[PDB]
Design a protein around this ligand. Sequence first.
Ligand code: CLA
Ligand code: CLA
Ligand code: CLA
Ligand code: CLA
Ligand code: CLA
Ligand SMILES: CC(/C=C/C=C(C)/C=C/[C@@]12O[C@]1(C)C[C@@H](O)CC2(C)C)=C\C=C\C=C(C)\C=C\C=C(C)\C=C\[C@@]12O[C@]1(C)C[C@@H](O)CC2(C)C
Ligand SMILES: CC(/C=C/C=C(C)/C=C/[C@@]12O[C@]1(C)C[C@@H](O)CC2(C)C)=C\C=C\C=C(C)\C=C\C=C(C)\C=C\[C@@]12O[C@]1(C)C[C@@H](O)CC2(C)C
Ligand SMILES: CC1=C(/C=C/C(C)=C/C=C/C(C)=C/C=C/C=C(C)/C=C/C=C(C)/C=C/C2=C(C)CCCC2(C)C)C(C)(C)CCC1
Ligand SMILES: CC1=C(C/C=C(\C)CCC[C@H](C)CCC[C@H](C)CCCC(C)C)C(=O)c2ccccc2C1=O
Lengths: 91, 87, 227, 41, 205, 742
Amino acid sequence: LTADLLARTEANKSLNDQKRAATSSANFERSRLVTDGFCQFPQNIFGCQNAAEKGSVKFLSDDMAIECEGTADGKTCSSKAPGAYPSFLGL
Amino acid sequence: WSIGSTENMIVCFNTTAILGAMRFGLMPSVKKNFNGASSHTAMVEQANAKTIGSRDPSGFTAVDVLAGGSLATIISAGEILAGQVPY
Amino acid sequence: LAPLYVLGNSEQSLSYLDGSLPGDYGFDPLGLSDPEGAGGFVNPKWLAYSELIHGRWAMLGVAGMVAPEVLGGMGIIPQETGLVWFKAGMIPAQGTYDYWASPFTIFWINAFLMNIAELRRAQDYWNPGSMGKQDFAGLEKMLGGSGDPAYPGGFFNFMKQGEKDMAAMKTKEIKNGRLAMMACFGCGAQACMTGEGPVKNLVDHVIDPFGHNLLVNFSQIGGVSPF
Amino acid sequence: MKNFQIYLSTAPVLAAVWFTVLAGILIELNRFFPDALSFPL
Amino acid sequence: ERPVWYPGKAPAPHLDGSLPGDFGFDPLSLSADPEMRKWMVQAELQHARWAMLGVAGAVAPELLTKIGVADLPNWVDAGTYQYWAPAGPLFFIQMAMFNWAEVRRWQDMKNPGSMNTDPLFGYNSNDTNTDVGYPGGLFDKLGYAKDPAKAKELKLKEIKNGRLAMVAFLGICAQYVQTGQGPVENLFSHIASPGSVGYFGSQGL
Amino acid sequence: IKTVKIVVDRDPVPTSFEKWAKPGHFSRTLAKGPATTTWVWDLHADAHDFDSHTTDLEDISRKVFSAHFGQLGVIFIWLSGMYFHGARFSNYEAWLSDPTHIKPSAQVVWPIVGQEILNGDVGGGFQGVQITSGFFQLWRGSGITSELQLYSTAIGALICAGLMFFAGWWHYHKAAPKLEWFQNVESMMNHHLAGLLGLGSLAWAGHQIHIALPVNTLLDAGVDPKEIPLPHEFMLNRALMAELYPSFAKGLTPFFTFNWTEYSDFLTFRGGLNPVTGGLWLTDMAHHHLAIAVLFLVAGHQYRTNWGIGHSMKEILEAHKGPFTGEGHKGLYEILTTSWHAQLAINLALMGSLSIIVSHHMYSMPPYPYLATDYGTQLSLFTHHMWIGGFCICGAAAHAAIFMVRDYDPATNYNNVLDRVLRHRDAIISHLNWVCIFLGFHSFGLYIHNDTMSALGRPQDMFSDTAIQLQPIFAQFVQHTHALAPELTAPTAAGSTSASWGGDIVAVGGKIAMMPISLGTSDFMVHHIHAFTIHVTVLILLKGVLFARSSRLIPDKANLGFRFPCDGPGRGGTCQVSAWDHVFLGLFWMYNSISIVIFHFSWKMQSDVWGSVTGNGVSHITGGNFAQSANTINGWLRDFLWAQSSQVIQSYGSALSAYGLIFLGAHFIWAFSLMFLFSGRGYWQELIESIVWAHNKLKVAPAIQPRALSITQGRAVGVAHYLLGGIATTWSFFLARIIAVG
Ligand code: CLA
Ligand code: CLA
Ligand code: CLA
Ligand code: CLA
Ligand code: CLA
Ligand SMILES: CC(/C=C/C=C(C)/C=C/[C@@]12O[C@]1(C)C[C@@H](O)CC2(C)C)=C\C=C\C=C(C)\C=C\C=C(C)\C=C\[C@@]12O[C@]1(C)C[C@@H](O)CC2(C)C
Ligand SMILES: CC(/C=C/C=C(C)/C=C/[C@@]12O[C@]1(C)C[C@@H](O)CC2(C)C)=C\C=C\C=C(C)\C=C\C=C(C)\C=C\[C@@]12O[C@]1(C)C[C@@H](O)CC2(C)C
Ligand SMILES: CC1=C(/C=C/C(C)=C/C=C/C(C)=C/C=C/C=C(C)/C=C/C=C(C)/C=C/C2=C(C)CCCC2(C)C)C(C)(C)CCC1
Ligand SMILES: CC1=C(C/C=C(\C)CCC[C@H](C)CCC[C@H](C)CCCC(C)C)C(=O)c2ccccc2C1=O
C-alpha cells in the first residue's frame, strides 16, 4: 500500500501543494474577510463559513472548491466527507 | 493452539485449581477471606457477603467464579508469556 | 428459584424484588433497583418500564433482522429487498437501497413520526390519564391508557388477546423481550465480527459448528471488509 | 426571568457588558477612522 | 384543563388562558411578570402581523411572475432592484415614518386611551379604548370586531396565522440561505418530486 | 460493612434565578448586603468556600461534585476552542507537509491598530501568531491529517462541554447524591483505576493501534496526508491494516491464545526516538498504553465494594502501626472520608509532583512527532508544567493547613501518625531549618566564592570544572547504568529510554531532536541550588501546616482561623502567623525555585543539547558556555539573562513585538506587586479618608463606604501580581528567545 501511496504522492504532489496553499490562505483570510470586504454585513448575516461553503468567498470558497479536487477514487476525500450536517452555527 | 495443547492445558489447570481452592476454603473467596480476620493462617466468613445468592452447597458464587477465572487467566498469561519474550 | 437466577439475588436484591413485577426472578446483582436512594433515571419504575420498551424494540428488531434475509433467501420477497439488516440502508457505506424517497428524507420522516409517538408515550408514563383528555384529532378515546404505562389496554390491545391468563402472558413477554435483547446484541456482535447477516451465521454454525464459531472467527474478524 | 434581569443589572455583569460595547465602538471607530494621531483640521 | 402546547403538561402558571392563542407554552417563564407579560403580548402581536405581511409580500411578487401578469424578482433580489431612490433615502423616510407611527404605538402601550385621536384632524379612532395592540376603530375599516364573541376567536385566528407566518418567514430565510431561490420556487420544486428535491432530498446536508 | 449503592435525593434544590439576583446568598454576613467595599472582596474570596457556607457535609459534597462538572465543562470548552482554532485559524495542513520548516500557528489577529504585524511569517503561505502549546504535534501523533477531523472533534468537545454542564445541573438540581454516595472511596478507587485510567488507557491504546499507528507510519514513510486512507478505512478494513503491519492478518487469535509475540511488529519495546520525526516510537507508545491499561484494570479490583473479595482501606491503614509511630495510621480513614480539604491537599500535592514529572519526562523523551525539533514548544511545555506543579504543591500545603485548622479533631487523632507529627513539630522544623541554612550557605558560597575568586583574578581557586572538581558522581553513575540498561538490566529493550543518558545523538532535519546530557560541576551546583530552594519552600509550607493550630507564640491559633492577618503587635509582633501567610511566603519561594529550575533547563538545553548538526560536530544555540559560566552569578546574569534577552528586547517591529510588550508589562506588574507587598493597610486607609473627604466635598460620596484592602487581601494581591509579573516576564523572555533563535 505504502508503495502506491508514495507513488501517487509523487504524481499528485503539485496539486496537493496547491490544496495546502489554498486552505492556509483561506484560514488566514478568515481573519480579514470584513477588512478586505468579502463577508461584509449582508453576506455574513449567517455564518460566513456557510457563505464560503454555499455562496462565494475569495479565499475560503476557493479552498472549499479545491479541497476535494483530484483525490483518490473509491475513498471519501481526506479533506472533506461526502456529506455532513451543517457546521454548528456556521462556525 | 488447540485442545490439549500446552497453553490450553496450563490455563485449564490454573482455573480448575483456583476455583477448587476458593470453593473449599483454601483461597480467599467472596464468602470467606481475610477481611476482618485475625492472622495469616485463618480466614473468616464474611457476613456482608454471606448468603449473597448461590445454589452450590458450599455457597460458591458467580463473583467467586469470575474472580477465580480472572486470577487464573492472569496467572496463565504470566506463565505462558514466559518463554515468549525475545531476549 | 432456578439455576442462573440465584446468581444475582442477595439480601439487597431480595429486599425489594418481591416477585409480583412481571418476570421478576430476583436477578439484580447491582443495587440499581433499590427503592431507597432512588432518583433520576435509576428509579425502579423507570428501569422496569425501560426494560419492557427495550424488550419490545428488540423483538421487533430481531424479527426485522431475520425476516428480510430469510424471505429473500427462500424467495418470498425480492432479492434486492431481502438485504441483510446492516446493508439495508442503515449504513450507506456498508450498503443502501433505492427506496421511494432519499434515505435521509426517510430518516426525517421516521424521526418526526417517532417523535409524535414517543412523546405521547412519555406523557402517559409521567401523567397516566392525561393522554386521553386533550383532543388529539379525535383519537384520544382509544389512547387513554390503563394507569400502568407499561400496559395500556386501549387501542394497542384491540385483539383483546391474552386476557384469560394475563399474568402468565405478562411474564411471557418479559422473557421474550430479554431473549430478543440478547438476540439483537448477538446479531450486531457477529455482524461486527463475521461481516455477514445473522441467518447466514446461524446456518454456518448449523452445518460446521467447529469451523463457524467464535474462536475460529477470531482469525477472520472482517470477512470481506466493505470500507 | 425578572430576577435574572436583576442579576444582569449587577455591577460585574453590567461592567462587562458596558466595556464590551465600549471596546466594540472604539475598535469600530479605529477601523473606519484608523491611525488618527490628531484631530484633523 | 384547556388544550395546551404539550398534552399532559400543566400550562405555565403565569398563563391562565385569558389571552388569544394561550396554550401554556413558556418553559423559560419569560412572561411571569404581568407588566412584562403585557409588553411581550404586544411583541408577539407586532411580530406576528409583520411576519404575515412579510410572507404576503415575499410570496405575491413571485406568484405574479409565475402567473405572467408582470415580471418581478425574488424577495431577496428586490433589495438590489434599482428604484427611484437608493436604499439610503428610502430607508431614511421609512424610519421617519415609523418613528412617528411607533411612538404612537409606544404611547398606546403605555397609555391605552392615548393615541386614539388624530393629532392633525381630530378624528377619534375609539372613544376611550383600552385593548392595547388591537386598535379596531383606528384600523378596523370593515367592522369585524363589533361583537366580543366574534372578536375573541378572530383574535385567536390572527395569533395562529401570525405564529404560522413567523415560522414561515424563518423558513423562507433558511431556504434562501440553503437553496438560493425564492420560497415559491422551492415550493413548486418540492411539489414536482418530493422524493428527489427537498432538504435531505437534494443531498444538501 | 455498608453496601455500595447509588443514593440520591430527588429535586433537592429548584432551578431559579432568584439567588442570581441576590449576591452573597451562600453566606449570612454577605447576604444582608454591602456596608463597605470590603464586601465585594469578601464575596469573591468565599465564593468557593463551601465549608464556611453550610455546616452539613452532604450539601458541600454535592456542591463540589457539580463544581467539578462545571470545571470539566470549562475544560471541554477550552479544548473545543483549541481544536476549532486549529481548524479554521491555523496552518496545520501546511505544517503537516513541512513540519521541520513551517512554524506551527493557530491564532490570527484582526488587522485593526497595526497589530497585524503579530501575524508572523510562520510558513505555508500563512500568517498568524506562532503557537508553542504543541497542539500540532499532538494532533499529528494522534493521526489527524485534515482540518475536518479537527473541526469534528472541536464540535464534539463543545457538545461534551454542554453535557458536562448539564450533568452538573442534574447532579445538583435533579439527582444530587447523598453523603453516603461520596464516601464510597473503595468503589471510587475501583472505578477510577479500572474504568477511568484502565479503560481510558485501553481506549487510547486501541486508537493508537488502529488510527494513529497506520497514519503515522504512512507519514513516516513519506506519504502525503491528503493521500493517506481515512482512519475508519484502517480500523475496519483489516487487509489494509495488515498491509502495513502483517500481524493484523492473524486477527485476535494470538491475543486470545496468549501468542502475543506475533503482535511484535506493532507492539514493540524499541526505546529511544523515531529518527525521522524525533518522537517516541508509536508502537512503543501503543504497547505502553496497553500495559498501563492492563495494570490499572488489575489494580482497580483491589478494594471490596459489594462482594466480599477485595480490601477495606480502613483496615489496611489501621494495621500499619509500629514501635515508633504509636497507633500508626489509625483514624486517617476518618480524616480522608470526612474532610474534602485533606483529600484536596493530597491530590494537589500529587498532581503538582506529577506535572513536574510530566515536564521532565516530555523534554527527555519527546512523545510527539517533530516536538523535540521544535525547541519553542518543548521549552514552553517544560516551563508550563513546572509552574503548574509548583502552584499545585503550594495549594496542597494550603489545603493541608485548611484541614488542620478546620477539620482536624484531636479526639479521633489521639496517638496516630498525625498527632505524633504534631507532638514533635519543633524537631521537624528545626532540622528542616538547619538543613535549609546549610544548603543555602554551601550552594550560594559555591556561586559567591566563585564570583569573588573570578573578580580577584583567581580562576584556579574557583569551583569550576578546571579548578575544584565537584563532580556529580552519583548522577553520572545513574546515567551510565541507564545508557547500559538495554544490554544487561533491560535486555529486551532495543534502546535506552532517552538519548540523554549517552550515545547516538538524535537529529531531525539538521536540528537535534535529542542529545545525551552531560553533568559537570555547574550541574552539581545548580542541582544543589534546586534542592536548597525546594527545601526552603517545604520548610515554609510544612511550618505553616504544623503550626497551623498553635505555637509557643500563639497557643490559641486554631480558633483564630486558617486565614487571619495577625494577632497584634504584641509578643514583639505577631504578623503573618496564620498558615495562610505561610502559603504566601511558601508561594513566593515556590516561584523563586521554579524560576531557577526553568532557567537551568533553558540554558542547559540551549548550550549542551539543542543546536544543529552540520556534519562537523554540534553547533549548539549558545555554544556550550553553560559548563564554564554557570558556576557564577555573574555568568547567569551575563551569559543567560543579558545575552539571551537580546531577542526579546530587540523584538520590536517584528511578530515578537508582542512578547517584548509583555516583557515590559510583566516587569511593571511585578514592580506594581511590590506596592502591595511592602505597604500596609493603615496608610492606604488614611489616604482613602482624604480621598473620601474630597468626594464628600462634592457630594459624590458612595453609599458603599470605601475601604482599604484587608491585610490578608493586601498580601494576596501582592503575591498574585508578583507571581503574574515574574512568570509573565520569564514567559515573554523564553518564548521570544526560543522562537527567534529556533
Ligand atoms: C468507570 C467509571 C468511572 C469513570 C470513568 C469516572 C470518571 C471521573 N470521575 Mg468518578 N466516580 C465513579 C466512577 C467513575 N468515574 C464512581 C463509582 C463514583 C462514586 C463512588 C465516582 C465519584 C466521583 C466523584 C465524587 C467525582 C468523580 C470525578 C470524576 C472525573 C474526574 C475528572 C477527570 O479525570 O476527568 C476525566 C475526564 C473524562 C474522562 C472526560 C469525559 C467525562 C465524563 C464525565 C466521563 C463519564 C464517566 C461516567 C462515570 C460514565 C457516564 C455515566 C452517566 C451516563 C451516568 C472523571 C471524569 C470528579 C469530577 O470531576 O466530577 C465531575 C468528582 O468530583 N467521580
Ligand atoms: C478499546 C480499544 C480498542 C477498540 C475499540 C478496538 C476495536 C477493534 N479492534 Mg483492536 N486492539 C486493541 C484495542 C482496541 N481495538 C488493543 C489494545 C490491541 C492489541 C492486542 C488490539 C489488537 C487488534 C487486532 C490484532 C485486531 C483488532 C481488531 C479490532 C476490530 C475487531 C472488532 C471485532 O469484531 O471484535 C468483536 C467485537 C464485538 C463482538 C463487539 C460488537 C458488538 C456490537 C457493537 C453490539 C451492538 C448490538 C446492538 C445492541 C444492537 C444492534 C443494532 C443497532 C446498531 C441498531 C475493532 C475495530 C481486528 C481488526 O479488524 O482490526 C483491523 C484485528 O484483527 N484489534
Ligand atoms: C484543585 C484545586 C483547588 C481547589 C478545588 C481549591 C479550592 C479552594 N481553595 Mg485553594 N489553592 C489552589 C487550588 C485549589 N483551591 C492552589 C493551586 C493554590 C496555590 C495558589 C491554592 C491556594 C489557596 C489559598 C491560599 C486559599 C485557598 C482557598 C480555597 C477555597 C476558596 C477559594 C475561593 O472561593 O476563591 C475564589 C478564587 C479567587 C478569589 C482567586 C481569584 C483569581 C486569582 C487572583 C488568580 C488569577 C490569576 C490568573 C490566572 C492570571 C490572569 C488574571 C487576568 C484576568 C489579568 C476553596 C476551598 C482559600 C480558603 O479559605 O480555603 C478554605 C484560601 O485562603 N486556596
Ligand atoms: C538574595 C536574597 C535573599 C537571601 C540571601 C535570603 C536568605 C535567606 N532566606 Mg530569605 N527571602 C528573600 C530573599 C533572600 N533570602 C525574599 C525576597 C523572600 C520573600 C519574602 C524570602 C523569604 C524567606 C522565608 C519565608 C524564608 C527565607 C529563608 C532564608 C534563609 C535560607 C537559608 C539560606 O539561604 O542559607 C543561609 C543564608 C544564605 C546562604 C544567604 C547568603 C549569605 C552568603 C552565602 C554569605 C555567607 C557569609 C559571608 C562570607 C559573610 C560573613 C562575613 C561578613 C560578616 C562580612 C536565608 C537566611 C528561610 C529561613 O530563614 O530558614 C532557613 C525561610 O524560612 N527567606
Ligand atoms: C559555604 C560555602 C563556601 C565554601 C564551601 C567555600 C570554600 C572555600 N573557600 Mg570560599 N567563600 C565563600 C563561601 C564558601 N567558600 C563566600 C560566601 C565568600 C565570601 C565572598 C568566600 C570567600 C573566600 C576567599 C576570599 C577565599 C575562600 C577560600 C576558600 C577555600 C578555603 C576556605 C578555608 O580555609 O576554610 C577553612 C575551613 C574550616 C575551618 C572548616 C570547614 C568546615 C568543616 C570541614 C565542617 C565539618 C563538619 C563535619 C561534617 C561534622 C562532623 C560531626 C561529627 C564529628 C559528629 C575553600 C575552597 C580561600 C581560597 O583561595 O581557597 C581556594 C580564599 O582565599 N573563600
Ligand atoms: C442486550 C441489551 C441489554 C442488555 C442488558 C443487560 C445484559 C443487563 C444486565 C443487568 O441489568 C441486569 C439484567 C441485572 C443487573 O443487576 C446487572 C446487569 C448486568 C447490569 C439490549 C439490546 C437491545 C436491542 C435493541 C433495542 C434492538 C433494537 C433494534 C431495532 C430498533 C431495529 C433495528 C433495525 O432498524 C434497523 C436499525 C435496521 C433495519 O434494517 C434492521 C432492524 C433490525 C429492523
Ligand atoms: C417580523 C418577522 C418578519 C417580517 C418580515 C418582513 C416585514 C419582510 C419583508 C420583505 O419580504 C418582503 C415583504 C418583500 C421584500 O422585497 C423585502 C423584505 C423586507 C425582505 C418575523 C418574525 C419572526 C419571529 C420568529 C421566527 C420568532 C420565533 C420565536 C420563537 C420560536 C420563540 C419561542 C419561545 O419564546 C416562546 C414562544 C416560549 C419560550 O418559553 C420558549 C421559546 C423557545 C424561547
Ligand atoms: C463442577 C460443576 C459444574 C462445572 C463447573 C465449571 C467447569 C465452572 C467453570 C467456570 C469457569 C471456567 C469460569 C471462567 C471464568 C473466566 C474469566 C472470568 C476470565 C477472565 C479473564 C480476564 C479478566 C482477562 C484479563 C486479561 C486480558 C483480557 C488480556 C490481558 C491479560 C489479562 C489476563 C489480565 C457445573 C456448573 C456443570 C455444575 C456444578 C458443579
Ligand atoms: C494600593 C494598596 C491599597 C489601596 C487599593 C484600593 C483600596 C483598591 C484598588 C482599586 C480598585 C480598582 C477599586 C475598585 C474600583 C471599582 C470597581 C470602580 C469601577 C472601575 C472604573 C474606574 C472603571 C490597599 O488597600 C492596600 C492594603 C493592604 C496592603 C497594601 C495595599 C495597597 O498597596
